[PDB]
Amino acid sequence: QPVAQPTDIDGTYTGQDDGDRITLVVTGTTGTWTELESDGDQKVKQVTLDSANQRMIIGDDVKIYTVNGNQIVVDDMDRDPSDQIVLTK
Amino acid sequence: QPVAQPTDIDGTYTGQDDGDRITLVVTGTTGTWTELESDGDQKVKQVTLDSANQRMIIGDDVKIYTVNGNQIVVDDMDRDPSDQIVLTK
Numbered sequence: 665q666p667v668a669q670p671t672d673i674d675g676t677y678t679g680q681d682d683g684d685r686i687t688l689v690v691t692g693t694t695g696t697w698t699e700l701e702s703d704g705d706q707k708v709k710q711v712t713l714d715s716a717n718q719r720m721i722i723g724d725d726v727k728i729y730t731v732n733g734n735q736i737v738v739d740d741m742d743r744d745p746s747d748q749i750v751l752t753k
Numbered sequence: 754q755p756v757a758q759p760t761d762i763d764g765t766y767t768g769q770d771d772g773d774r775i776t777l778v779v780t781g782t783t784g785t786w787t788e789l790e791s792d793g794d795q796k797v798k799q800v801t802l803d804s805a806n807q808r809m810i811i812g813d814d815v816k817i818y819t820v821n822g823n824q825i826v827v828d829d830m831d832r833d834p835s836d837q838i839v840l841t842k
């Protein structure tokens with residue numbers, strides 16, 4: 665289904681994904697997604713947040729997001745739980 | 754109805770109620786509720802947060818709370834909108 669998300673979720677949320685530390689900074693309806701690799705490099709992707717349709721676009725990859733207070737759960741469109749990412753501020 | 758709330762909502766939320774500034778600090782499942790009066794006095798009440806049953810106890814007054822990201826909406830049990838308080842971090 666498509667469930668509308670809260671619109672005010674400014675903050676800096678962190679978590680882990682396939683060994684990389686993820687840092688999501690949300691400013692309004694946009695953001696940045698930063699991955700910290702093993703070697704210490706970082707990959708930075710621009711984010712847009714579609715709150716009505718629950719869509720998080722990271723670079724050009726479409727995700728689903730769910731806001732639970734300080735927690736943001738990020739899912740693949742097929743919600744493959746092997747690929748779910750949990751971020752917390 | 755009774756809708757369960759996110760459990761991780763640490764932060765400092767502010768708003769206004771009947772001319773007083775309200776500051777809600779949440780730590781885990783507890784908190785403090787501070788009212789700033791006109792004369793500059795403050796009234797401080799202890800808070801408990803019942804996330805499963807959506808109940809916020811402020812001192813000994815029972816409220817309903819709804820978490821929308823950085824926003825916490827606090828309602829009387831009869832949800833009289835004349836008495837709703839919106840707090841944001």
Ligand SMILES: [Ca+2]
Pocket residue numbers: 672674823842
């Ligand atoms: Ca803000």
Ligand SMILES: [Ca+2]
Pocket residue numbers: 701703705
């Ligand atoms: Ca590299």
Ligand SMILES: [Ca+2]
Pocket residue numbers: 740742744747
């Ligand atoms: Ca998949």
Ligand SMILES: [Ca+2]
Pocket residue numbers: 681682746747
């Ligand atoms: Ca993975």
Ligand SMILES: [Ca+2]
Pocket residue numbers: 734753761763
């Ligand atoms: Ca925390």
Ligand SMILES: [Ca+2]
Pocket residue numbers: 790792794
């Ligand atoms: Ca006084």
Ligand SMILES: [Ca+2]
Pocket residue numbers: 829831833836
């Ligand atoms: Ca009433």
Ligand SMILES: [Ca+2]
Pocket residue numbers: 770771835836
């Ligand atoms: Ca009032």
